[PDB]
Structure 1
Amino acid sequence: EEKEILWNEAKAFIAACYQELGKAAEVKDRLADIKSEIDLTGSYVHTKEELEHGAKMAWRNSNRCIGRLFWNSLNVIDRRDVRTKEEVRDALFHHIETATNNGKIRPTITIFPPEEKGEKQVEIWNHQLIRYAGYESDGERIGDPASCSLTAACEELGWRGERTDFDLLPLIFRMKGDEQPVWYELPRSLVIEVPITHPDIEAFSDLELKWYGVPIISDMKLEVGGIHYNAAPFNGWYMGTEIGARNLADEKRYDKLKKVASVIGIAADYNTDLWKDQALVELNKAVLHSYKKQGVSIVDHHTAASQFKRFEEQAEEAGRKLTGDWTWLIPPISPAATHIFHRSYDNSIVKPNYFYQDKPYE
């Protein structure tokens, strides 16, 4: 059954990919080649052009992403050649450096060797390549609660965090044939961080908030033409609400809204005062101001929705069906101020795409 699934996905992908690349004439011969390869080897190998366009198609098909207007300019780094943990480490360090680009963030994906018999060659444990640790011991909570289980796993392996609220987790990944993952500290010179200040409220710096510049999701599987690239970290730039309305605001994350209310000088006592809403707006204004001031790329949710409208228009013009997940596309503040809130979206899954996979810790 597996080989049939592979061949079927292969036929569909190659036809679509080559059509988009104006290479429809080459489909017949390429498919012939692929079927023999599947017959002999049990799998097939993407050309560099196929791999690049496939990763771009996968972003374009990501129903939950508002940032898809720019799918065709994804920078694809082919690291199917890696075989050692030092090569994986150095590739991940390089992704950080080239994606960061001194603050002018470049959307980038680095693609490692794919699974073979469903057998992973490289298994990355990090959820993002840059993320803060989290701790919870006898009532005491430190750092990012979303990272508690991964943090505990790292400390089982001999890492020790300083227990600030912003400890950088090490890179952690496992190679085929190794029983345990290895870990490596991130060099601080690779990691840009932004202190959060407010354009008008001087006291906002008293909160001592900061966040990292680049979100690099490293635990999803890229699927292209039936080939499963379980290790393929990718990044864009942040939409400010991810940081201001979720990472810093959620009660199960940094939970800062009461502290924000106090520094902006409003009471946090009555629901009818809408103090949480006001605090959210000022925190989100501070996040955008601070990234801009430091020259680190970021987009606000209004501009992002406007870009997404153009993505919808471009899909229609190209004669492609648009898919989307309304529940993720609407921003978590002022959603009805965006056009997204007022229309609906087909949430069908189209491949190539990025998928969740089981965590090897937990």
Structure 2
Amino acid sequence: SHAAILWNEAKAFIAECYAELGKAEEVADRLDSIKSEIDLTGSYVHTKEELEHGAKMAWRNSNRCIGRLFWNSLNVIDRRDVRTKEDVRDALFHHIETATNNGKIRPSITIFPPEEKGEKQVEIWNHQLIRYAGYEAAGEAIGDPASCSLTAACEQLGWRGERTDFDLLPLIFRMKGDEQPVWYELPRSLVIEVPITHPDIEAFSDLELKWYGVPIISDMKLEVGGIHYNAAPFNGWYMGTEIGARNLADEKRYDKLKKVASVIGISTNYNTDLWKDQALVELNKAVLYSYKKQGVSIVDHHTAASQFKRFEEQEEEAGRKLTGDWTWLIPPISPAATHIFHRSYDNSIVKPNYFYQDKPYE
């Protein structure tokens, strides 16, 4: 069944949604109208309000997210009107632009058309609109290993990277009707990057490290009232450790710890020296310092956790049960220094929410 599943979800969503918006009386007629539409067309269409809030509710229900305090300030851009590839390209460009906001990043989400009878109207391949390529010749590795398969997929369609450690992959999506996707390179004037330097250590720039300024997840599905928005790229700002303790530090990512240990002048001879731990704190300090120097929003794990704590409180004050995933909520650097580590969370899925979906490539 599908006509049953939908109408069920719809009644639940519209009820909770209007309850929060203060339009409990309008639940009656709206649900009558949706009933006709589901039987008439075989689905329904959300209003700019239902969807905007639905996107905000899905944010608040994101267990694995430490920054849900600002759920209610999401900038929902409604682009369910797109019909061509140029329309999609221009919307992603706009999204990157307005979201970046010259450095003062703005949490935003672009809502593209949802699936009709299970068939997607638009299909975004990218994990994040802005991301570096990854290559691994029979010899060694160049770039972000995490991007390996998507990079392969793009080179299969005519795209070719210069092969540096920081090649910006192109935008890649498929439109309903097209068998294969299309790609568009990102105008470099749209993409803000940040070179990594250290406040006290002058040698740190020899590492020639840098990272893009805005993470825009683009491969997740957004479920709201039974409607599946398979394409709805969203973004918040970065949390220092995502770049300094994972992207640049993981052995399966960039793996910069030995290098960092060297430029900061410490030995990588013994584990008892805790050099990896000392290197992580200098790299993480460098990352927070650079983004701040350049005027691009970022947050350290202490402020974030502290902000998350205030969320937990607000959720109780409003009467909503709280859900969270401890294994992803704790920062990868000094978890036991934040309150998140010491308490527990109910890892229960509540819709509306964002879900993983199967990669088209691979």
Shorter-chain TM range is over 0.9
> Aligned partners of 1:139, 1:346: CA distance in 2, in Å?
46
Cα distance per residue 1:44-101 (max 9 Å; x no partner): 0001100000000000000000010000000000000000000000000000000000
Partner-residue secondary structure (3-state), 1:354: strand
> Aligned partners of 2:175, 2:268: CA distance in 1, in Å?
50
Equivalent residue, structure 2, for 1:31: 31
> Aligned partners of 2:200, 2:62: CA distance in 1, in Å?
37
> Aligned partners of 2:70, 2:23: CA distance in 1, in Å?
23
Cα distance per residue 1:97-120 (max 9 Å; x no partner): 000000000000001000011100
Cα distance per residue 1:224-280 (max 9 Å; x no partner): 000000000000000000000000000000000000000000001111110100000
> Aligned partners of 1:31, 1:278: CA distance in 2, in Å?
58
Partner-residue secondary structure (3-state), 1:123: strand
> Aligned partners of 1:147, 1:290: CA distance in 2, in Å?
25
Partner-residue secondary structure (3-state), 1:198: coil
> Aligned partners of 1:268, 1:68: CA distance in 2, in Å?
38
Q: Show the 5 A alignment for 1:1-362.
A: 5-362=5-362
Shift of 1:140: 1.6
> Aligned partners of 1:28, 1:16: CA distance in 2, in Å?
13
> Aligned partners of 2:64, 2:208: CA distance in 1, in Å?
31
> Aligned partners of 1:258, 1:140: CA distance in 2, in Å?
17
Partner-residue secondary structure (3-state), 1:211: strand
Partner-residue secondary structure (3-state), 1:50: helix
> Aligned partners of 2:337, 2:204: CA distance in 1, in Å?
27
Partner-residue secondary structure (3-state), 1:24: coil
Cα distance per residue 1:183-231 (max 9 Å; x no partner): 0000000000000000000000000000000000000001000000000
> Aligned partners of 1:269, 1:239: CA distance in 2, in Å?
30
Partner-residue secondary structure (3-state), 2:25: helix
Report sequence identity in percent.
95
Cα distance per residue 1:280-336 (max 9 Å; x no partner): 000000000000000000000000000000000000000000100000000000000
> Aligned partners of 1:71, 1:269: CA distance in 2, in Å?
46
> Aligned partners of 1:356, 1:339: CA distance in 2, in Å?
28
Cα distance per residue 1:330-361 (max 9 Å; x no partner): 00000000000000000000000000000000
Cα distance per residue 1:149-184 (max 9 Å; x no partner): 000100000000000000000000000000110000
TM-score of the superposition, structure 1-length normalised? 0.99
> Aligned partners of 1:229, 1:124: CA distance in 2, in Å?
11
Shift of 1:28: 1.1
> Aligned partners of 1:103, 1:49: CA distance in 2, in Å?
28
Partner-residue secondary structure (3-state), 1:280: helix
Structure 1 consecutive aligned stretches of length 4 or more whose deviation exceeds 4 Å: none
> Aligned partners of 1:198, 1:270: CA distance in 2, in Å?
24
> Aligned partners of 1:51, 1:309: CA distance in 2, in Å?
27
> Aligned partners of 2:140, 2:264: CA distance in 1, in Å?
27
Partner-residue secondary structure (3-state), 2:189: helix
TM-score of the superposition, structure 2-length normalised? 0.99
> Aligned partners of 2:139, 2:301: CA distance in 1, in Å?
36
Partner-residue secondary structure (3-state), 2:203: helix
Q: In the comparison of the two structures, how many residue pairs are matched?
A: 358
> Aligned partners of 1:272, 1:122: CA distance in 2, in Å?
53
Shift of 1:40: 0.8
> Aligned partners of 2:301, 2:171: CA distance in 1, in Å?
30
> Aligned partners of 2:267, 2:118: CA distance in 1, in Å?
55
**Runs of 5+ consecutive residues of structure 2 not aligned to the other structure:** none
> Aligned partners of 2:302, 2:36: CA distance in 1, in Å?
50
Partner-residue secondary structure (3-state), 1:119: coil
> Aligned partners of 1:165, 1:132: CA distance in 2, in Å?
8
> Aligned partners of 2:54, 2:272: CA distance in 1, in Å?
50
> Aligned partners of 1:135, 1:147: CA distance in 2, in Å?
8
**Runs of 5+ consecutive residues of structure 1 not aligned to the other structure:** none
Partner-residue secondary structure (3-state), 1:109: strand
> Aligned partners of 2:58, 2:118: CA distance in 1, in Å?
20
Shift of 1:139: 2.2
